[PDB]
C-alpha cells in the first residue's frame, strides 16, 4: 500500500509561453507523462493509490479523483476523469492581474490533509507509506515563504516524503523542502525525455530508493538574509520578541516596534 500524490504546476502563463515558443514539449506531453506515471504506479501493484492535483494560479483543484481501446479498465476510467478534469479546468478559465504567479503551498496543504484522511481509512493490518511528487515549471512567488515552510514541517512530522522534478528553473524553497523531508530533487536537462526521468527516479517507492543507485544529492544552500536590505548574512542580529533577522545593529527594532533595552 503506497500513495503517490503528483502535483503538477499548471501555470497557464508559463505553459502559454512554452506553447507560443513552438517547441516540441508543451503541456499535453506534460500531463500525458503525468498520466503514464500514474497508470504505471497503479500498474506496479494492486493496492497502490493515486491522486493528482493541479496547482492553477488561483485554485488547487484536484484532477484525480468499459475498456474501449484495450487498457485495464480502472486505468481507462482514471485517464478519462483526468482528461475531462483538465479540460474543464484550463479551458474554462479566468484572468486577473494582481495574482498571476503560481502557488505551491496550498496544493501541498491539500495533499497533506488528503494523506491524513486516507491514512485514517487504512485498517490495522496494513500500513500506508506516502510521498508527494512536485512537477514544477514556473517561478515560485517569494510572498508565501511564511506559509511554505509550514507545509514542509507538516511533511516532516507526517513522515511524507517529498520529491521534485523541476523543469525550467531551479527553486530554492523546493530543493529546501526536498532536503528537509528526506525526499529527492532533480533538475531535468532536456524537456521531452521527462517520462523516462520519472519512471526511473521518481516512480520507485521508499523501499527502492535504498536499492537503486540514483543521481547524487546537490549541495543545498542555507543562505539567509536580513529583513532590512535583503543581502546575504554570515553573522546577523536576531530579536527575541519579533524573532526576525537584522543584518546591522540598530537601536529601535522595526519589525515589532520594540522599546529595546539598551546596554
Amino acid at each position: 500500500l503506497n500513495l503517490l500524490v503528483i502535483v503538477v504546476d499548471a501555470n497557464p502563463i508559463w505553459w502559454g509561453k512554452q506553447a507560443l515558443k513552438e517547441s516540441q514539449f508543451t503541456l499535453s506531453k506534460c500531463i500525458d507523462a503525468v498520466m503514464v506515471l500514474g497508470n504505471s504506479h497503479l500498474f506496479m501493484n494492486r493496492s497502490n493509490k493515486l491522486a493528482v492535483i493541479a496547482s492553477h494560479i488561483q485554485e488547487s483543484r484536484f484532477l484525480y479523483p468499459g475498456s474501449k481501446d484495450g487498457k485495464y479498465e480502472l486505468l481507462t476510467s482514471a485517464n478519462e476523469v483526468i482528461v475531462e478534469e483538465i479540460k474543464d479546468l484550463m479551458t474554462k478559465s479566468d484572468i486577473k492581474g494582481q495574482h498571476t504567479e503560481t502557488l505551491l503551498a496550498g496544493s501541498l496543504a491539500k495533499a497533506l490533509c488528503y494523506i491524513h484522511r486516507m491514512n485514517k481509512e487504512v485498517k490495522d493490518n496494513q500500513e500506508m507509506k506516502s510521498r508527494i511528487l512536485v512537477i514544477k515549471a514556473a517561478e515560485d512567488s517569494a510572498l508565501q515563504y511564511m506559509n511554505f515552510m509550514n507545509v514542509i514541517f507538516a511533511a516532516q512530522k507526517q513522515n511524507i516524503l517529498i520529491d521534485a522534478c523541476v523543469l525550467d528553473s531551479d527553486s530554492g524553497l523546493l530543493q529546501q523542502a526536498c532536503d528537509i523531508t528526506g525526499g529527492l530533487y532533480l533538475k531535468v536537462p532536456q524537456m521531452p525525455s521527462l517520462l523516462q526521468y520519472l519512471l526511473w527516479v521518481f516512480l520507485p517507492d521508499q523501499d527502492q530508493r535504498s536499492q537503486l543507485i540514483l543521481p547524487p544529492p546537490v549541495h543545498v544552500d542555507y543562505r539567509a538574509a536580513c529583513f532590512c536590505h535583503r543581502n546575504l548574512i554570515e553573522i546577523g542580529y536576531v530579536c527575541s520578541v519579533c524573532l526576525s533577522i537584522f543584518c546591522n545593529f540598530s537601536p529601535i527594532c522595526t519589525t515589532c516596534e520594540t522599546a529595546f533595552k539598551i546596554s
Binding site: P12, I13, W14, W15, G16, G97, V188, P192, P216
Partner: protein, 78 residues
Amino acid sequence: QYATSQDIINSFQSIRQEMEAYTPKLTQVLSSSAASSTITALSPGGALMQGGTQQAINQMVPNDIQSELKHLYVAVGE
C-alpha cells in the same frame, strides 16, 4: 522579473485555446530516441549522474594518527 502584462493576456489566450483540443496518449507522449538518450543520461557516465557520492578518503594509518589528533584537538580546544 515577470515581463509586461501584455504577456498575461497573450498567455491566457494561448492556454485557453490550448486546453480545448486534448488527449493524445499513444502518439504524442514519447519518442523512443528521447527515451534512449534519457537512459544514456541516467547511466553512470552521463548528465544528471554528477560523478558524485565518490568521497575519496585517506584511510592509510588510522589508529595512532587518530590518537595524535585526539590529543591535538583537546589541546587546541582548551
